[PDB]
Design a protein around this ligand. Sequence first.
Ligand SMILES: Nc1ncnc2c1ncn2[C@@H]1O[C@H](COP(=O)(O)OP(=O)(O)O)[C@@H](O)[C@H]1O
Ligand SMILES: Nc1ncnc2c1ncn2[C@@H]1O[C@H](COP(=O)(O)OP(=O)(O)O)[C@@H](O)[C@H]1O
Lengths: 444, 370, 70, 355, 48
Amino acid sequence: IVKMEVDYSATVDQRLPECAKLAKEGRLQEVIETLLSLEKQTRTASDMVSTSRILVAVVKMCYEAKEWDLLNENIMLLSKRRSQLKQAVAKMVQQCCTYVEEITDLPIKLRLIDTLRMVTEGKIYVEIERARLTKTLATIKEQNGDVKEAASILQELQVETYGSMEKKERVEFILEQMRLCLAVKDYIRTQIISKKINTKFFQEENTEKLKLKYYNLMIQLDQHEGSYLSICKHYRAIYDTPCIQAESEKWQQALKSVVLYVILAPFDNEQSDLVHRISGDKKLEEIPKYKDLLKLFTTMELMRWSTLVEDYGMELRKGSLESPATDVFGSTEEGEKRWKDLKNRVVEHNIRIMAKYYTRITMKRMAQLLDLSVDESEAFLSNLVVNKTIFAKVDRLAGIINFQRPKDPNNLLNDWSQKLNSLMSLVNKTTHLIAKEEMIHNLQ
Amino acid sequence: KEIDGRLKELREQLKELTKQYEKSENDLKALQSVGQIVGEVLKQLTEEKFIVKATNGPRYVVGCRRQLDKSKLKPGTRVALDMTTLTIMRYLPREVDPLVYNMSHEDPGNVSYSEIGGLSEQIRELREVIELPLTNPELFQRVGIIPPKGCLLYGPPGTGKTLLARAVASQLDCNFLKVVSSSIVDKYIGESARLIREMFNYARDHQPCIIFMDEIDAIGGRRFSEGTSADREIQRTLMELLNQMDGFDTLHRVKMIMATNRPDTLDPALLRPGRLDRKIHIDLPNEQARLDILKIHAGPITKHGEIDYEAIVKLSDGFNGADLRNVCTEAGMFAIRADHDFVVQEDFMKAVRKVADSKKLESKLDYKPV
Amino acid sequence: CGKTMLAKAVAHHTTAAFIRVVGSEFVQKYLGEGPRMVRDVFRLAKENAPAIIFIDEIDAIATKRFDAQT
Amino acid sequence: KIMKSEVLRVTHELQAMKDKIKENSEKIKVNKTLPYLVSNVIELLDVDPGKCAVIKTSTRQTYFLPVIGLVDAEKLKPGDLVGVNKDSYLILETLPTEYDSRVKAMEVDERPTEQYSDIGGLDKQIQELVEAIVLPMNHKEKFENLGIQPPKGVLMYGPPGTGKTLLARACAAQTKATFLKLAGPQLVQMFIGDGAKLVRDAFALAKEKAPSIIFIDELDAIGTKRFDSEKAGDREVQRTMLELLNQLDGFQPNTQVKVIAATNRVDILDPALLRSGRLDRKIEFPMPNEEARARIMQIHSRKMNVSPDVNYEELARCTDDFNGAQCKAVCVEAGMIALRELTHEDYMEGILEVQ
Amino acid sequence: GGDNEVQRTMLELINQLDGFDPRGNIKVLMATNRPDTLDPALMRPGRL
Ligand SMILES: Nc1ncnc2c1ncn2[C@@H]1O[C@H](COP(=O)(O)OP(=O)(O)O)[C@@H](O)[C@H]1O
Ligand SMILES: Nc1ncnc2c1ncn2[C@@H]1O[C@H](COP(=O)(O)OP(=O)(O)O)[C@@H](O)[C@H]1O
């Protein structure tokens, strides 16, 4: 930073070890003060290596003489005297980081926060920030997982993540704080941090247990409130990882989860694309979920969930592994919520398939097909139409419904004319075909 | 084998060769090719009637016959016409400023921007004005602000501005536009602001364009008293430039990097915040920065471990990296003299004193900063 | 004062057509149709009695009187 | 095996292939022998759903020949003066462009004939710049194999009459390459960008015509010492100065076209042109001593045989603070009076006449 | 910029009466009342 004026390498070499011997147990503070004067002299002489060695020696003397309190105000004075040399203080924090991690003790938490206060004065991205990250991670381990330190590690990561990250160390630090955030069970902030970090991909092509760990912590975050389409998308994003690391149990249970989720997701054009892409997989045939997907994806079958709970509901009781199935539906509280989420999901599916097949269906039959009463069937029918999914008009006094838009006489005669022209074209094609086949058949 | 190996000769002579009969037909095809006149459709008269200005002659109207996709044609689109076929036979997109294109797409093979020392602050200034807005718009979305537009570099004529401009040009080499800000003058009254609008339209076509132009003082000026017709052409060119870069419609993801030598003579209207968001002065190289540049320039030099670099630092002061390859050069043909394979420290001392005595003569080595 | 905030207003204070014209754009190769466009814009103005014509950037380009014709 | 069938096709397919372009070329070369429309290339890289072009014709027309049907855009770089079909409205063939009116032939000497023997006095300096300029021309391959790119900018500073102009032309003659001379004191043009345009086409002309010698005179006039007063701030000449700066690196590859700048006082330049990749070889041009001045005028008068046995020693004594130009004027003053003085005494008055 | 066409004429006239190859055929004489010639007044000792 600034040019060195007067070096004292000879002075520190001839005196510092002698000072250490004179204060082996640290009972003398005049020795600390005289090295403070010496490092002040070198600081005014703008020497960095001499000051750094003095600070390293001072903390080392405090380590061996185990004066924890006197260390606290000593490092406070050193870091607050005039701010000294940024290289020297960055060094001194580093050996302090190396020392606080070896002695468990009770007041190391006080040591951790003390250095945190010394480094939080600024100068984070510049002059060492990994020490502060390690101290915050060290605090997490000391408190064994809570909400206050999880918030602290939440509000710390952003500066160093944006400034100077590591393709392994930084992302693991992000993974090690979101799990605490999910442990706190905060959802808005955990969603915000997850979506601001997942933009940094294209390293997962060489992941060992990182992309899967990220995903398996954000599975609970999404599915907690309402997510069902993003659930299937990253459950297939953890399905393609056993493709390169073929382990049967995780692979098969991932297949069971993604197949169940992709069907369970609310109907949309994108979900139709995923279910068609998922279907036809060569490696998916050997599981009962293959039969479940083939039945429940297409051909507009009557998805009577009362029948499905025994026809294809065996995954609840016993399957090949039934570990994802028990996680989804075998649970008590969240399982019954997902059971109800299967219960309705097949109701809109049955309404949707009935929309393209039956124009007018009596109220009793539709309620029986939906496995509900008249009022519940009309309530869901109202739920579809307010979403503009289906074109439905009901006479509630009569209990009769219609799905065909009233045909305006303009386009009604247009399709009649198009039907006429199609017939006219068919006459032309048939006439040419029969007359020419007539010509071939009378070549005799 | 004689019937085998004599074959392998004769067909190879051709392949790429004997590729002439069709080249002949193509140029004969050109010989009877109709040349279709070119205009810009000002506006669409009706669904089948389109008002088109010939680039030179009058506005005609033409009409697509059966399948020319009249919907995709827009007021201002480019179509081919014929004074005989009465219609548009095919449609054509736009232009790209060709003269500017090649001189902006012929960036020579440079070295990395890390090969110049002492300007790390300027390097990170370039990163947080170019890379940051496009890589992470989500952070600025949480911020809710627009990224800055441009940055100015000024100082002594020897700083590394050309190296930095060439290094950032070599970083992309595909969407980087270089401007020298002096080919604007031409024989005709036109084609002065027409070109300026054209690569601005090119900057509209490609979002991540980095526009570099040098010597704003070559168009800037302070104020022209008793202006000449050539002076008057600057001020309308400057005004057109100002109203096309700031104006009423702004640019998106387009950043302008400009450099000059006289900051005081620049027009105050351009340098106000909003057009020039940041002003950066590249100062004198530091003594340790000069040491790093000297080591960089003396990399591939046959020398042993006796060179007193500190002596060079003490003697050579106020000397840009320009003067340092001079010293490296001057030690070069000093080594050529007497036919010495290696370079001795005395050659560097001769170079330092000769360059120092060279530099004594010149005064006012740098303009004062604003 | 903006010098156009009264033209963007007023045209809405009393409902009236507003045209930017732009003098700098007008001086171009379309000098032959320059008379025609003035006729066209005047006809547009005459078509809607509630209208105002607003022309900009006259000083620098549009018929400066002290500098000789170039 | 299968040769005799292959080549009876091949040689036939070779000769008939080439004959039809011989027909076609003719069919387009007569059109190339009748082009009429300048090529103001307004390019589009129209990739076929490769390239394309717009040609502002001479008759004020525009023709969008598709994909440029005859000439590759690698060589057909934009500009003007490239053959266009008068009937087919297609790009025909490249042809030399226009060298900016003044630059077409400002003062360009095709080949100088002045020899290195008639100049002298500064032989150490003249040999120094020959090694830095002439050798990079004749033995250019030696530098190419060595790996060191020769420097290009040589600044030759010294009071007038030191033989800078002859030395530059003599060096150009030795290189046997194109020589281009720039009237530096008159590059200050009232027209905006005129001097910038002139220097561009001078560099363009030099690049198009051999490894040349760009001999720019009056570098002090071109570049001010940045001593900025409101009397004159070198505002409009800083335009042209940085223009010369950005064209100094145009010929860095293949290391051709050297720049020689002649002035009297190098101190009147800012540290812009004194750059290692730019003008770097500054060579002093002092007034010759008594021996050198006597030798210079003796060489000048070598073609004069009127007065035998003139040792010019008294002339050397009387030639105090005189230039090589002054020595030439002194000797030719004898060449004007030595009719019908004569020996060792018809030389003094030459300097006295000028003032 | 005051008298630049004069300078245009000066450049071309020097190119014309430079002689190139010396020739005793053509002659040139320049007559004024005051020696107000430009900078070529020092090149002319070789020419005029
Ligand atoms: N900071 C620097 N580091 C390395 N080389 C430099 C530096 N500054 C100048 N040079 C030398 O100067 C030449 C580049 O000219 P430059 O100074 O970039 O022109 P400008 O300052 O007008 O942009 C190169 O040959 C380079 O070696
Ligand atoms: N060493 C020399 N040998 C022969 N003639 C010389 C020499 N030095 C100068 N001259 C004369 O000087 C004239 C060149 O003058 P000029 O180019 O104005 O001087 P400078 O190159 O120093 O500016 C030539 O006509 C030439 O006759």
